[PDB]
Each structure stands twice: as structure tokens, then as C-alpha cells.
From Swiss-Prot:
This is Breast cancer type 1 susceptibility protein. Changing T71A: In BC; benign; functionally neutral in vitro; no effect on in vitro phosphorylation by ATR. Changing T43I: In BC; uncertain significance; functionally impaired in vitro. The gene is BRCA1. The chain holds residues 1649 to 1859 of 1863 of the full protein. Changing W186R: In BC; pathogenic; functionally impaired in vitro.
Length: 208
């Protein structure tokens, strides 16, 4: 019916969110799931920091909503419509380039459509599986080893390394395959703005 999670709040603020849910017969989870409907985010007056849940929130085209949505509904003895209340960036996108918009409204076409992503070698900040499940969420196709791209002329393939996580071999990925090596940052920024971005700024020196 309606399931909720929330990001970058203090307990003081959590309190309300609880008592907001409680009031309007809503369920609550600490852990973003496939079955969630809403992500609630701290802001500024509508700009959020960049949480893991931020991404999978958009990833989903769920309701990605700033906190004010709720303190304003407590105030006004009633729930407000969500459609007047979603977030509009962080740092990738300023107040400028609202993402969750497209996300929610798109879906019938995803932003990874017919691609193949391999999240290659060490991660940390945001660890492999979620990363994959992320792109997997917006219709990318997930490979485990470079040695599994079904090039089959048709589909386009990508490697994504997180660069720093490994302590200097990731120049020599081109030494195994004929997809490009974009950097994690490609995914993230692409999923924030929910366009599919330009590998240009994100490619990694591939060394014969
Ligand atoms: Co092409």
C-alpha cells in the first residue's frame, strides 16, 4: 500500500516521521527494499545530500520526497500530496537539475535500456551488489567477469571500476576486452540526473 524509508535524519526528526506514519496508517523500514514506495530526505528549502538510499530511491522511480513534506503535514492535520514535494539535487544536480522527476514519470523506458555493466574489481563507499542492483534497477544488464560480455554485435557493454579502491593494474583492463572503462562516478551521476550520460568525462586510460 504505502511503505517508507528515510535518510540523513536525527532521531529527533525520526520521531515525527514515525508519528507521521503511525497517524496515516503507513509502514516503515530502515532498509530500502524492492517493496518500498517512498524515500524521505533531509534538505535546505529541496536539495539533498547523496545517500545510498537516494540512488536506489530514484533507481526505483519511487517517491523521493524531502522531509518538509512531513513536518508540513503534521502541521496541517493531514497528509499532503507527494506530487508537490520531491527533491532536486545535491551536488551532481544543484537545486537546478531535479532527477527523481524523470525516474518516476519515465520507467516505460529506463535509462540503461540495452546495456551491459560490469562493476569491475574492488568497491567500498557503496559496495558491489547494491551498485549492480542499482543499474539492474534501471534496465542495465549485469555481468560478473569481463569474460562474459555477450557482445553479439547488438548490445553495448561497459566496465565500471571504482578507481581508488584498488591500491595500479586498472589501466590494463583494455588489455582484456572491447567495452569502455568508465568510473563509478558515471553510474551515480547518471542515475541522479536519470539521463544516461557521456562517457567522455569518465573514461580510464587504457594502456596497450
Ligand atoms: Co552503439
Amino acid at each position: 500500500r504505502m511503505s517508507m524509508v528515510v535518510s540523513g535524519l536525527t532521531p529527533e526528526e525520526f520521531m515525527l516521521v514515525y508519528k507521521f506514519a503511525r497517524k496515516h496508517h503507513i509502514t516503515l523500514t530502515n532498509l530500502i527494499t524492492e517493496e518500498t514506495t517512498h524515500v524521505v530526505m533531509k534538505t535546505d528549502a529541496f536539495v539533498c545530500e547523496r545517500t545510498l538510499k537516494y540512488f536506489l530511491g530514484i533507481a526505483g522511480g519511487k517517491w523521493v520526497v524531502s522531509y518538509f513534506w512531513v513536518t508540513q503535514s503534521i502541521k496541517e492535520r493531514k497528509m499532503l500530496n507527494e506530487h508537490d514535494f520531491e527533491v532536486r539535487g545535491d551536488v551532481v544536480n544543484g537545486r537546478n537539475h531535479q532527477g527523481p522527476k524523470r525516474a518516476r514519470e519515465s520507467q516505460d523506458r529506463k535509462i540503461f535500456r540495452g546495456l551491459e555493466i560490469c562493476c569491475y574489481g574492488p568497491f567500498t563507499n557503496k559496495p558491489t551488489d547494491q551498485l549492480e542492483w542499482m543499474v539492474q534497477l534501471c534496465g542495465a544488464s549485469v555481468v560478473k567477469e569481463l569474460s562474459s560480455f555477450t557482445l553479439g554485435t547488438g548490445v553495448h557493454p561497459i566496465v565500471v571500476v571504482q578507481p581508488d579502491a584498488w591500491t595500479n593494474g586498472f589501466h590494463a583492463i583494455g588489455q582484456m576486452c572491447e567495452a569502455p572503462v568508465v568510473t563509478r562516478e558515471w553510474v551515480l551521476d547518471s542515475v541522479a540526473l536519470y539521463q544516461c550520460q557521456e562517457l567522455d568525462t569518465y573514461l580510464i586510460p587504457q594502456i596497450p
